[PDB]
Structure formats: C-alpha cells, structure tokens
C-alpha cells in the first residue's frame, strides 16, 4: 500500500533515503495488534482513529486528553493519516495530567496496569506499549518498564529531550526496553534528542505532524514523537509475523537503516527505524 503525501516521518520509516513523500507499508497495517499509549490520554473521538482508539485507564479526575501530547502520540502509532500501523488498536492509559506531568508512582502503576490489562483484550498479533515520557534516573521506573517488557509487551520509550546521555533518564535507561532517540527530516540527530549507548534506535522526531485534541492536527518535536513511530512499527511488524514483543526492538535494530544519521556521538547507535517493505 502507499499513502501519498504522507507526513515526512511516515515516509522516512518506509524509505532508505530522506526527502521522500510517500509511506509504503503492508496493508495489514497492524491489524490484530494493540498499542497502549501511556501518556496524557487519547482523544478517541478524533475521526483519525476510526473508533480504533479507546481509553482504558486514568489516574486523574478525567480520562480526557486536556493536553494533546498523548493524542499526538497515538496518532503517530495508529491514526489513519498519521500513524504507522493504521489498523492497530490503541489503548489509552492516562498517566500524565493535562500539563504533561505525572508522578513516578503513577507511571509505574500505569505500566503494571498494562501488563495485566492486555489479558483483558484480544490482541492475537501481540501487544505494544508506547512511553513518550521520562525524567531523572529511577530504578523503580526502569524495573517497571522491564516487567512490562518481560510480561509480553513491546516497550518503546523516549530517550529524552535533554541533548544529554540517556543514562541519567528513566525509563529511557532501562536496557530491556526499546529506547528511542529523535532525528529530523534531514537525517540529523534532533538538536534536543538524548543519546548514549542505552539508545536502541532512532525515529522521526522533529516537526512531526499528527492528531491533536479538539479534532485538530499539529506538528510538534521531541523524542516523544519518535517513540510512537517505533511503537507503531513494532506493532506493524508483529502483525506481519516478522517479530515478537520480546524480539521486536532487536529486530527493528537488525533491519534498520544503518549509519545514515549525522551528529550521532561516538557510542550512540546510528540506526533509523525502517519497515523494509517491498511491494
């Protein structure tokens, strides 16, 4: 299948050279898979989701997305125009308040929630969790992301927007989960993207057009935008039988465009998420 004039990030993950404008993907499009977007929520009513998104948990007075951030990320996972896996099922776990803040204890709760709640859902192609969130090093938070991973879910996390080593950030620094740096449309490392040996993969991250609350759309930047690309990819590849939840991050790194990024510091991988689809 081909999506003409797709957002640059979508086009990038389907391409070997930057600058292209079409996103190429198998039509299964993550059908049968499930991506938990753990964030400020998802505007499940947005026509971009087609009734494939639904909120399943909140730790706040409302489960609505009063921010747009979480909606932006779920749009990059599974929205019809903006997502990688366009037939996937999107579950909203709202661990962030409408300012994008959340307490670690709540984040952990949300992760533990997902490990169990996937057993309430029909996801015969497997389960992905997307964590466009983080802060200072916490081993409790890392352990939580590890458990979620070990529990049979593919965990993609943002590397962080500090332009520092992701070593000092969580869940970004948890080895067993897929930790995602951000690049721009020119295959540069995004100016803000964290780096270091704990990164596993880069994804499109600067000027990412995607769904927004109020049924709108907008372009924002961050490793929070790269994460859902790899989350969507994971789910897309699991539907295709090509990998499993436990193997996906390694698969994506095996099959990624290698060496194509600039301003990658020594010690940080130079791998750009890539679906390797051949029509």
mmCIF file of C-alpha atoms in Angstrom, residues 28-173:
data_model
loop_
_atom_site.group_PDB
_atom_site.id
_atom_site.type_symbol
_atom_site.label_atom_id
_atom_site.label_comp_id
_atom_site.label_asym_id
_atom_site.label_seq_id
_atom_site.Cartn_x
_atom_site.Cartn_y
_atom_site.Cartn_z
ATOM 1 C CA UNK A 28 -2.312 -5.482 7.319
ATOM 2 C CA UNK A 29 -1.253 -2.199 8.958
ATOM 3 C CA UNK A 30 -1.030 -3.674 12.438
ATOM 4 C CA UNK A 31 -4.453 -5.358 12.340
ATOM 5 C CA UNK A 32 -4.710 -7.743 15.270
ATOM 6 C CA UNK A 33 -2.147 -5.880 17.416
ATOM 7 C CA UNK A 34 -2.577 -3.484 20.299
ATOM 8 C CA UNK A 35 -0.555 -0.425 21.216
ATOM 9 C CA UNK A 36 -1.020 1.034 24.674
ATOM 10 C CA UNK A 37 -0.228 4.746 24.505
ATOM 11 C CA UNK A 38 0.777 5.628 28.081
ATOM 12 C CA UNK A 39 0.502 9.416 28.253
ATOM 13 C CA UNK A 40 -1.963 12.326 28.713
ATOM 14 C CA UNK A 41 -4.726 10.228 27.106
ATOM 15 C CA UNK A 42 -6.124 9.914 23.586
ATOM 16 C CA UNK A 43 -8.998 11.856 22.040
ATOM 17 C CA UNK A 44 -10.588 8.587 20.985
ATOM 18 C CA UNK A 45 -13.317 10.608 19.217
ATOM 19 C CA UNK A 46 -10.885 12.024 16.678
ATOM 20 C CA UNK A 47 -12.018 10.782 13.223
ATOM 21 C CA UNK A 48 -8.377 9.916 12.563
ATOM 22 C CA UNK A 49 -8.761 6.970 14.977
ATOM 23 C CA UNK A 50 -11.870 5.499 13.324
ATOM 24 C CA UNK A 51 -13.126 4.066 16.599
ATOM 25 C CA UNK A 52 -9.912 2.063 16.957
ATOM 26 C CA UNK A 53 -8.783 4.105 19.975
ATOM 27 C CA UNK A 54 -10.330 3.805 23.382
ATOM 28 C CA UNK A 55 -9.299 4.969 26.814
ATOM 29 C CA UNK A 56 -8.934 2.142 29.308
ATOM 30 C CA UNK A 57 -7.389 3.716 32.380
ATOM 31 C CA UNK A 58 -6.804 7.101 34.003
ATOM 32 C CA UNK A 59 -5.363 8.178 37.361
ATOM 33 C CA UNK A 60 -6.937 11.658 37.251
ATOM 34 C CA UNK A 61 -10.349 13.299 37.619
ATOM 35 C CA UNK A 62 -10.806 12.835 33.858
ATOM 36 C CA UNK A 63 -9.582 10.422 31.212
ATOM 37 C CA UNK A 64 -9.859 13.119 28.542
ATOM 38 C CA UNK A 65 -6.720 14.416 26.867
ATOM 39 C CA UNK A 66 -6.579 18.003 28.044
ATOM 40 C CA UNK A 67 -3.108 18.347 26.546
ATOM 41 C CA UNK A 68 -2.850 16.902 23.046
ATOM 42 C CA UNK A 69 0.510 15.237 23.681
ATOM 43 C CA UNK A 70 -0.935 11.746 24.162
ATOM 44 C CA UNK A 71 -3.302 12.306 21.266
ATOM 45 C CA UNK A 72 -0.319 13.382 19.182
ATOM 46 C CA UNK A 73 1.492 10.138 20.003
ATOM 47 C CA UNK A 74 -1.426 7.733 19.431
ATOM 48 C CA UNK A 75 -1.931 9.496 16.121
ATOM 49 C CA UNK A 76 1.631 8.572 15.191
ATOM 50 C CA UNK A 77 1.048 4.958 16.274
ATOM 51 C CA UNK A 78 -2.265 4.225 14.608
ATOM 52 C CA UNK A 79 -4.216 7.152 13.135
ATOM 53 C CA UNK A 80 -5.360 6.695 9.522
ATOM 54 C CA UNK A 81 -3.424 9.614 8.082
ATOM 55 C CA UNK A 82 -0.602 9.988 10.555
ATOM 56 C CA UNK A 83 0.162 6.546 12.002
ATOM 57 C CA UNK A 84 2.477 3.669 11.152
ATOM 58 C CA UNK A 85 0.082 0.819 11.991
ATOM 59 C CA UNK A 86 -3.168 2.138 10.552
ATOM 60 C CA UNK A 87 -5.329 -0.851 11.550
ATOM 61 C CA UNK A 88 -3.969 -1.330 15.058
ATOM 62 C CA UNK A 89 -5.979 -0.942 18.259
ATOM 63 C CA UNK A 90 -4.980 1.981 20.501
ATOM 64 C CA UNK A 91 -5.468 1.833 24.263
ATOM 65 C CA UNK A 92 -5.160 4.991 26.316
ATOM 66 C CA UNK A 93 -3.598 4.808 29.736
ATOM 67 C CA UNK A 94 -3.589 8.386 31.069
ATOM 68 C CA UNK A 95 -0.657 8.610 33.487
ATOM 69 C CA UNK A 96 0.105 12.245 32.666
ATOM 70 C CA UNK A 97 -2.008 15.193 33.751
ATOM 71 C CA UNK A 98 -3.057 17.872 31.305
ATOM 72 C CA UNK A 99 0.335 19.611 31.753
ATOM 73 C CA UNK A 100 2.206 16.517 30.680
ATOM 74 C CA UNK A 101 3.344 15.874 34.230
ATOM 75 C CA UNK A 102 2.862 12.684 36.205
ATOM 76 C CA UNK A 103 4.330 11.209 39.358
ATOM 77 C CA UNK A 104 6.678 8.247 39.031
ATOM 78 C CA UNK A 105 4.440 6.136 41.287
ATOM 79 C CA UNK A 106 1.556 6.798 38.890
ATOM 80 C CA UNK A 107 3.629 5.986 35.807
ATOM 81 C CA UNK A 108 4.680 2.701 37.444
ATOM 82 C CA UNK A 109 1.050 1.944 38.270
ATOM 83 C CA UNK A 110 0.179 2.599 34.633
ATOM 84 C CA UNK A 111 2.892 0.226 33.438
ATOM 85 C CA UNK A 112 1.828 -2.541 35.842
ATOM 86 C CA UNK A 113 -1.761 -1.860 34.675
ATOM 87 C CA UNK A 114 -0.833 -2.564 31.037
ATOM 88 C CA UNK A 115 0.966 -5.854 31.816
ATOM 89 C CA UNK A 116 -2.306 -7.129 33.285
ATOM 90 C CA UNK A 117 -4.870 -5.362 31.089
ATOM 91 C CA UNK A 118 -3.520 -6.869 27.881
ATOM 92 C CA UNK A 119 -5.040 -10.113 29.205
ATOM 93 C CA UNK A 120 -8.493 -8.485 29.016
ATOM 94 C CA UNK A 121 -8.003 -7.600 25.326
ATOM 95 C CA UNK A 122 -7.920 -9.560 22.089
ATOM 96 C CA UNK A 123 -4.513 -8.858 20.581
ATOM 97 C CA UNK A 124 -3.689 -12.099 18.712
ATOM 98 C CA UNK A 125 -0.860 -10.312 16.884
ATOM 99 C CA UNK A 126 0.721 -9.122 20.141
ATOM 100 C CA UNK A 127 0.955 -6.029 22.310
ATOM 101 C CA UNK A 128 2.998 -2.822 22.208
ATOM 102 C CA UNK A 129 3.315 -0.094 24.858
ATOM 103 C CA UNK A 130 4.451 3.436 23.934
ATOM 104 C CA UNK A 131 6.007 5.643 26.667
ATOM 105 C CA UNK A 132 6.669 9.169 25.397
ATOM 106 C CA UNK A 133 7.630 10.145 28.921
ATOM 107 C CA UNK A 134 10.510 10.198 31.319
ATOM 108 C CA UNK A 135 12.543 12.060 33.881
ATOM 109 C CA UNK A 136 15.537 11.565 36.161
ATOM 110 C CA UNK A 137 17.048 8.167 36.774
ATOM 111 C CA UNK A 138 14.769 5.949 38.839
ATOM 112 C CA UNK A 139 15.402 2.252 39.099
ATOM 113 C CA UNK A 140 11.812 1.662 40.252
ATOM 114 C CA UNK A 141 10.657 3.141 36.949
ATOM 115 C CA UNK A 142 13.182 1.086 34.994
ATOM 116 C CA UNK A 143 12.106 -2.091 36.795
ATOM 117 C CA UNK A 144 8.523 -1.299 35.871
ATOM 118 C CA UNK A 145 9.333 -0.918 32.188
ATOM 119 C CA UNK A 146 11.348 -4.140 32.368
ATOM 120 C CA UNK A 147 8.391 -6.034 33.905
ATOM 121 C CA UNK A 148 6.063 -4.622 31.264
ATOM 122 C CA UNK A 149 8.544 -5.814 28.646
ATOM 123 C CA UNK A 150 9.038 -9.220 30.294
ATOM 124 C CA UNK A 151 5.258 -9.553 30.668
ATOM 125 C CA UNK A 152 4.990 -9.920 26.881
ATOM 126 C CA UNK A 153 4.662 -6.327 25.681
ATOM 127 C CA UNK A 154 6.960 -4.475 23.306
ATOM 128 C CA UNK A 155 8.026 -1.366 25.243
ATOM 129 C CA UNK A 156 9.230 1.648 23.222
ATOM 130 C CA UNK A 157 10.306 4.659 25.364
ATOM 131 C CA UNK A 158 11.574 8.127 24.512
ATOM 132 C CA UNK A 159 15.306 8.698 25.029
ATOM 133 C CA UNK A 160 14.661 12.216 26.400
ATOM 134 C CA UNK A 161 14.880 15.793 25.148
ATOM 135 C CA UNK A 162 17.918 16.891 27.156
ATOM 136 C CA UNK A 163 20.572 16.509 24.455
ATOM 137 C CA UNK A 164 22.447 14.513 27.097
ATOM 138 C CA UNK A 165 23.205 10.866 27.752
ATOM 139 C CA UNK A 166 20.019 8.850 28.316
ATOM 140 C CA UNK A 167 21.935 7.001 31.071
ATOM 141 C CA UNK A 168 20.570 9.542 33.518
ATOM 142 C CA UNK A 169 16.923 9.276 32.484
ATOM 143 C CA UNK A 170 14.124 6.805 33.072
ATOM 144 C CA UNK A 171 12.544 4.693 31.759
ATOM 145 C CA UNK A 172 14.910 5.704 28.951
ATOM 146 C CA UNK A 173 17.894 3.983 30.639
#
